Amino acid sequence: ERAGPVTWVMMIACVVVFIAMQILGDQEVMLWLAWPFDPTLKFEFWRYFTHALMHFSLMHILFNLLWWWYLGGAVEKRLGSGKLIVITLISALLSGYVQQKFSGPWFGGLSGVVYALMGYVWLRGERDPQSGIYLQRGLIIFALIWIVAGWFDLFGMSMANGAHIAGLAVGLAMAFVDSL
Numbered sequence: 516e517r518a519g520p521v522t523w524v525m526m527i528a529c530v531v532v533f534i535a536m537q538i539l540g541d542q543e544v545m546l547w548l549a550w551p552f553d554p555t556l557k558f559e560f561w562r563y564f565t566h567a568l569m570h571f572s573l574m575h576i577l578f579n580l581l582w583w584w585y586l587g588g589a590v591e592k593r594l595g596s597g598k599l600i601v602i603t604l605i606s607a608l609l610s611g612y613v614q615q616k617f618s619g620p621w622f623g624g625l626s627g628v629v630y631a632l633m634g635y636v637w638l639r640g641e642r643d644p645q646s647g648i649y650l651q652r653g654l655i656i657f658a659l660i661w662i663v664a665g666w667f668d669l670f671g672m673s674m675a676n677g678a679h680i681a682g683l684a685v686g687l688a689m690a691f692v693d694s695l
């Protein structure tokens with residue numbers, strides 16, 4: 516059993532962008548993929564989503580992709596590619612929106628999406644056991660440690676706590692709906 520298409524394409528896209536960032540520098544890549552940072556860019560629609568493809572350190576991309584691989588992979592396998600796509604698009608948009616509102620357009624990474632997937636997988640398994648999806652008891656602990664690491668700034672994750680709560684809200688909301 517291997518990761519499905521959406522899980523895989525996202526991971527490779529993040530690695531490619533990360534490489535581009537090491538070669539050209541973070542600033543040059545953000546210039547092209549960051550949330551619109553000037554009126555002149557408000558209609559370059561890819562920017563409302565591409566911010567999620569940029570990571571600023573090895574630990575940042577390492578842990579984001581591990582969680583995405585595990586959670587996103589599980590969602591895609593058991594619920595389908597369509598499900599992962601919607602959770603991803605919505606959480607990326609909302610967390611990106613909240614982040615820029617309070618901290619500006621210079622940010623990036625899948626942490627908002629990971630918070631969404633954590634909330635979704637955990638809640639879906641708690642309310643809808645026979646759905647087949649759930650967050651392994653032991654992994655809940657390390658998810659909490661990862662959450663705490665970002666919350667108290669012990670680990671730089673680009674995005675602020677408010678943005679992460681927005682991503683989490685999306686996952687919980689969708690899990691609630693799916694267990695309805």
Ligand SMILES: CCCCCCCCCO[C@@H]1O[C@H](CO)[C@@H](O)[C@H](O)[C@H]1O
Nearest residue numbers: 516517518581582584585588589592657
């Ligand atoms: C503490 C860091 C977070 C935990 C990371 C756990 C990663 C587990 C990855 O498992 C892999 O997932 C794929 C998609 O679900 C499966 O196709 C594959 O067979 C399986 O080997």
Ligand SMILES: CCCCCCCCCO[C@@H]1O[C@H](CO)[C@@H](O)[C@H](O)[C@H]1O
Nearest residue numbers: 630632633634635637641655658659683
């Ligand atoms: C986005 C991931 C967030 C994970 C937060 C989940 C909170 C779980 C911590 O509480 C524990 O929950 C278990 C299952 O609900 C109970 O068996 C246990 O008694 C309780 O101590």
Ligand SMILES: CCCCCCCCCO[C@@H]1O[C@H](CO)[C@@H](O)[C@H](O)[C@H]1O
Nearest residue numbers: 578581585589649650651652653654657
């Ligand atoms: C520094 C972070 C290192 C974390 C290492 C965690 C190893 C244990 C994770 O096991 C994974 O658990 C999943 C859910 O049970 C399985 O689906 C998957 O196949 C399995 O590989």
